Subunit: 135 residues, 10 copies
């Protein structure tokens, strides 16, 4: 909050991009075991996506897509944040979500959009990821 | 304003200690760890999931977990050690029950993921969850 | 900022209405009573007993009471009418049950003091609890 | 947001009622006077002298004053009727004492300026102080 | 702190007016209704459904609804009449499109539940949503 | 809720001048029984004296002094407000308090100073008085 | 906060009076209107347009408008009549100018839309804008 | 910052017990010279007393009593805090303050009560003491 | 936080840099210095004097100072790089002037104490002022 | 608010006394060049005086006077703070300000009154001085 100087402060939390390529579950547990009170980031405001988007475009090593903490654990278009927050904001890319081949149930940030809009993607895909934390 | 090995939550800092201690022996450890600490208190439906998940990830152990709830008068009058109000409950199946009329301290049950509570014999030994102001 | 025939609670204002209406009819009655009204939403363990006592003291009859929770998708996707977050639950025992796949609207149960919820058939004509900004 | 005939104190409204009534009558009178009303609960040192003058000046009559503190278990475990915490005591000398046997309700003592408390017979008729939320 | 025929939201008061007026008339009507009023501005993602449901319930008739957003410079430089920041957008599919370079005022689209926007001829006669400060 | 329109709003309390001439101990009781939560006025900040001064000069109908709620109930220079507020501000006139002839234990605003400065006075003197209320 | 015919702005109420008066008498009228009123003061870059528009809408007839800024020392020390700090300026081009003709009071320039300031003779009858605390 | 680690944070202030035995005036000056903005502690709420009590009982090495920043320098029951705070709260033990033999004008916390209640005491005695600091 | 070598003002931390850079190069420097950094934005009349004194006492050289205001689409539409609104202006005499239609980036004028603004060539190597969020 | 330990926290700012002797001109500049966002101290509340008065008395290594950031630049009783704050508070000493021999235009705190009250004195006089900083 109280954020480290290599983290992005925003609306009470601290956000950071991780360039390692991990599957969605791998990345979630990475954040949670990084420090108490960490998850894959949640978004809740129209004005948070641009600030996140620009931050990734400036500190992202590579071009890998970026996981965030939205999941469809019931495979029925009921999307949930892993920080147990409330799905009160959506920023989907065109024609998404689409459950392509019924393989996609996790959510990434699309590089083509500036990491601004969301896409549902195959869980086991190995991407970069964005942790959020309380400090 | 917590140390980076603690859980921030609603202005206080929480932490799981893996050593085994009796309820009283656990409360005293927290109190003497640093000025202004106690066995943790819970006051919101939302704090119960948050704690359960923190423990399930950082509990370098196996056992159940003490919290600072005690039936002092032994008549279902549950006080917190930190002297805060008892305005929230999260019991397990058919708890509290005073099994053998020797159970008066409260623990977090691992079979529930550490979300529900059970009254247990105070002199038994578990891990515990401290609660500190920093 | 709320009239005296209503209960003030956490910035919003509630009132039990005794005329029986089906779930849909009740929601719309609140909506058109005044701009910014819905069937009530509940978000804290502390809000439940305060609503339960208000109903008991001001409710005429022993009928059940509608609240703004329903499953529009008919698959356990519980959504409040006022679009607030489903961040709290107080289900009765063995609920929700989707009994005979006719129950999709949630009521407060009378013989629990109105602390616990039950999903019920939408056409059932109950009392209802409005929630309004002012 | 208090009306003019009430005392505004710390976010609640307080008013004395001079009609003589037993304790359970006083509590239910407030309850049904308006939604969100009970007998007064006192929580701060600074609140006792403020209620003290208010009653001293607007108590048209001469009686003791019920407040919403009672030993519902009859074993010196006192609870407020608004479900609030018991985080403050302001007893008189030699109180509480369960004198004789049935002194389980709490009254404000006129010989203290209505500042200190005495436990008294449930069924005794007194003036009473409602607190409400407007 | 709103009247009852008005919708309270995030510190301001909103109301739908069903008389059909061109954009500049609708702005001037709000302005003269009471000091400190303008055609509504919208600043949060959650504000849109709130307005969308209000209008649907209270829109006597069937029209598009003016809001206080216009492109005075006729070059995609949209400004709110209340001088607030243009920190939020909620366009309909393909809009804004400056059709035939004659569309510079913003309306709410009934075919989206009044959630999404379209740029429209300013002289078109629409219902309108005033926004006042009390 | 707010103050009534014939009252001065200042820092959460309401103040009104009353031109009736009363003894200090009658002034206090008039205020206390005007409405629950009323006492003779209490002043706590440097900037409060000008606001109270100007207000009186405009809505005062007379040339009398004005009682305020400061009292030496002990008769030994222990000045206390009737509202139980903190004696954390002083604005004494020249050579005050004086305990003139061991009879001056109640405090009045001095019209000769614009009603900005205080004077300890005989309590039985009949002056105007300033109430202070919570609404 | 305010009455329904006043402009609420940043915790105060503003209102224009179309009667013509000399500066001194305008100030006197505001002060004896209601306790806690003066000629208006301006402190933020963003307030001047908010006032400029309010007047342009509710000013009947035409003239210039007084505000509560003057110079009693007769140099260039401008003091508000509400004793607030002179921490914001907004003069018209080449103003102030002491056009030694009794020019020591400030008015709003209709040629700017009532946004920028000008020093003009005190005795000149102009309209005025009061600033009240409700 | 907002309280070191061996200090007790409470209601926006920091507190610490010093077991070095000192006189009441000596203890005051010790605090004031420890850091800018320090005094012998001040108590203001019914709930503050037991939090202090529990803290002292746990962290007080030694057995003596404990000074707090309340004294009667007018020697007439005019009790005032050294930090200029308002005497808006009392917590005396039974039969105190008793000005025993007109020697007692400084205040201490009483062991018999768990350091919860107060006692007026000879200002020259040697007790431990409780500092209070803004950080 | 705000390091002791930065200027605290209204929740953000500002620091002068004396290394001479083109405007884009100055912006990309800030953005890459620390997450949450851009060229400075200014929003209050009172912010301009405080920035001015800071630069006059801490900058080295006599270069004009860049800020993050830019006419990106080159039509007198000035936007901040940190995405805050353009609600404040402090232009210099007869500025902006798009001189020779080659000036689209905004600098501070040393000849005004670094208080007023001027549009300038985008690659004019100047000192710059970063605005960060710690 | 984030004051280091050698500074006085008060009402959101940090203050410190410097015993080095410097003129008013020089003292104001040393503060401003110490850290970004510094000036000679400003005072705005009745209660700020005794809190400053006591801090200086405890930490002043000298017998000298103390500069504050108040001066009459126009030279006509238009007292203006150097931090550009409002002159909303006065604490003038006895028979001050007095422009003694039309030479005194800057303001100091006098040791006579425990550094509580103000005197206008000579700009070029070399006194101790008090800085005020945002941290
Ligand atoms: Ca997809
Ligand atoms: Ca058990
Ligand atoms: Ca059911
Ligand atoms: Ca008794
Ligand atoms: Ca269009
Ligand atoms: Ca006298
Ligand atoms: Ca002129
Ligand atoms: Ca004693
Ligand atoms: Ca230029
Ligand atoms: Ca002098
Ligand atoms: Na988030
Ligand atoms: Na807790
Ligand atoms: Na609700
Ligand atoms: Na209460
Ligand atoms: Na709006
Ligand atoms: Na007061
Ligand atoms: Na103003
Ligand atoms: Na204290
Ligand atoms: Na800024
Ligand atoms: Na200051």
């Amino acid at each position: 909050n109280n954020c480290p100087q290599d983290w992005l402060p925003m609306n009470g939390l601290c956000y950071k991009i991780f360039n390692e390529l991990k599957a969605w579950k791998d990345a979630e547990m990475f954040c949670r075991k990084y420090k108490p009170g960490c998850h894959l980031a949640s978004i809740h405001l129209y004005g948070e996506s641009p600030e996140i988007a620009e931050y990734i475009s400036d500190y992202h090593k590579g071009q890998s897509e970026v996981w965030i903490g939205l999941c469809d654990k019931k495979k029925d278009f009921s999307w949930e944040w892993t920080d147990r927050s409330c799905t009160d904001y959506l920023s989907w890319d065109k024609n998404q979500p689409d459950h392509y081949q019924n393989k996609e149930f996790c959510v990434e940030l699309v590089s083509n959009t500036g990491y601004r809009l969301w896409n549902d993607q195959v869980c086991e895909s190995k991407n970069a990821f964005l942790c959020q934390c309380k400090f």
